[PDB]
């Protein structure tokens, strides 16, 4: 099982994108797994390989942002089983981003839900985060991307907070990262 870099790591220059390779069906008694890595059929050697057991091996290769956006191949040979991967050149739609205030009948609770609706995007790889007055907000969950009737994706994110914070805080921000966006970054803010 081979895996692409996290979309946020790829789009942000301040982050380190990693292609991951995981080996299934491995015993605890013979754990020596030799894993090689190739970038466009050229062997690289900077891969981090740690072990785990249920046994599976997670080999992590660090990659250049541009080399994934340019769609180079990334194969990991295992001994031999070989899995490659790259970025699909597909349709690209940028996301529409809306913030929905809490439902009125929730404003008499202890907690309120701030909802971010991000829709109409292609491909389905997206990153949604929350801030308030520039500080990181950690108390949130998001749905998986869902395919919409028109062939695009939408996602909801719910930032959960004490009602005190909702009433006393100046602003909250939905921060979206997607390849359809200029600079791969957009910030929507509500007061």
């Amino acid at each position: 099982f081979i895996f692409p870099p996290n979309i946020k790591d790829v789009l942000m220059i301040s982050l380190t994108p990693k292609v991951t390779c995981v080996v299934v069906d491995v015993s605890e008694d013979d754990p020596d797994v030799q894993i090689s890595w190739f970038v466009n059929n050229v062997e690289v050697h900077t891969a981090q390989t740690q072990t785990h057991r249920e046994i599976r091996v997670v080999s992590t290769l660090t990659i250049l942002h541009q080399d994934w956006m340019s769609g180079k191949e990334f194969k990991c040979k295992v001994n031999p089983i070989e899995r490659t991967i790259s970025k699909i050149k597909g349709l690209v739609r940028a996301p529409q981003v809306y913030i929905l205030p809490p439902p009125a009948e929730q404003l008499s609770r202890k907690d309120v839900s701030l909802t971010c609706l991000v829709k109409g995007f292609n491909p389905g790889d997206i990153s949604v985060e929350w801030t308030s007055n520039g500080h990181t907000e950690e108390n949130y969950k998001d749905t998986a991307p869902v395919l919409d009737s028109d062939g695009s994706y939408f996602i909801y994110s719910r930032l959960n907070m004490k009602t005190s914070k909702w009433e006393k805080t100046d602003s909250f921000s939905c921060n979206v990262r997607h390849e359809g966006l200029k600079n791969y970054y957009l910030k929507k803010t509500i007061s």
Binding site: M12, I13, L64, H65, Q66, Y184, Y185, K187
Partner: protein, 34 residues
């Protein structure tokens, strides 16, 4: 949010007048300087 380096990154990633060798160097400079 460091909008500057991200925007330099983005602009350099799509700059047509740069070859793959010069692209990687510019990106690495931006990436390392910030």
């Amino acid at each position: 949010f460091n909008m500057q380096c991200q925007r330099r990154f983005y602009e350099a990633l799509h700059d047509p007048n740069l070859n793959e060798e010069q692209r990687n160097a510019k990106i690495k400079s931006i990436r390392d300087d910030c």
